[PDB]
């Protein structure tokens, strides 16, 4: 039924740290196999996003607040989306890429589903490696 209890972790990233690398380090340290971002708040200086249907990554630098950071992650993969707001309330969003740097802080609550395992397997329909959910066993 792809059901499972959940174990949660709370963490705070520091100024200057790059988000993707830190999330991967956390996933590795705790050997998370089926995790997702359950909650997130903070700020960024550098932002790296890949807009819908775009192949290239867009790099931005400024004063940004993280409005939402959603998605799944595991030992060998992830799929995260980010939305940020600037000093005038304007928001931008897309597929989060490596390169986002913490401004003052990034608070996160990450959930792990012990009974499941996430992997990225080729989907003949979309043509990309998509989320595959199987029992941890």
């Amino acid at each position: 039924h792809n059901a499972s209890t959940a174990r949660f972790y709370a963490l705070r990233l520091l100024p200057g740290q790059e988000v993707f690398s830190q999330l991967h380090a956390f996933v590795q340290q705790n050997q998370l196999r089926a995790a997702w971002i359950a909650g997130c708040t903070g700020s960024l200086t550098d932002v790296a996003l890949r807009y819908a249907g775009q192949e290239a990554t867009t790099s931005l630098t400024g004063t940004f607040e993280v409005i939402s950071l959603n998605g799944t992650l595991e030992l060998t993969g992830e799929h995260l989306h980010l939305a940020v707001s600037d000093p005038y309330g304007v928001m931008l969003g897309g597929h989060m890429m490596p390169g986002c740097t913490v401004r003052t802080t990034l608070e996160l609550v990450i959930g792990e589903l012990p009974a499941l395992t996430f992997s990225r397997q080729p989907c003949a329909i979309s043509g990309y490696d998509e989320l595959h959910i199987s029992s941890r066993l």
Copy 2:
């Protein structure tokens, strides 16, 4: 105290599937009585949103990334909000309506609160059927 442990489900919707119908099918299959979207990431082609205070639904078609999908759902009701971003980072958001179609994928982590039951009961204050939380018992 309206407190409860939570059971989580992970799922992936496929290209071409309509979100509301699939969420309802999942709710029905597992007989979820007090669920909420704990995490979500993906993409859409068709988007159906009802903007703030509007009576009519706005239908859009294009290349969109799902930035956030939040809300509650249960056997006989739901209340979900969606935010999407286009190929240029521009975002749009509102009350999600039936009609949103998956582009490449939609990854979801849904939580269910076994000790509670969600229902929609008339609120003399707002004038609409609002979320009512009671013990599962």
Copy 3:
């Protein structure tokens, strides 16, 4: 490892209620020490946001839908971000401040991490009081 199980609460705020005060009342009533917004949907009339890097709070009044409300909260502190959409799909976001009032409803699922305790301690790096996570014990 800053890990913990989670206990969840579901609640609905009423028309006219101010969000910060109600969240604090809920935190106080249940003596929550390490909580976060796990899910949220609803509408607002008055919106109080502090944009990225800004010192002053921006006050708005109108017809808004809550697209996302994220962040942590505890007995003596909180850090929440809000994103809202107007009658034309336009979104605005920032650091949520006291002053946001419910329009028709605000549905929330709040998680509490029993094994942890959140506090705000001075960070010599950012220069502000930041999230500090310690064991509940």
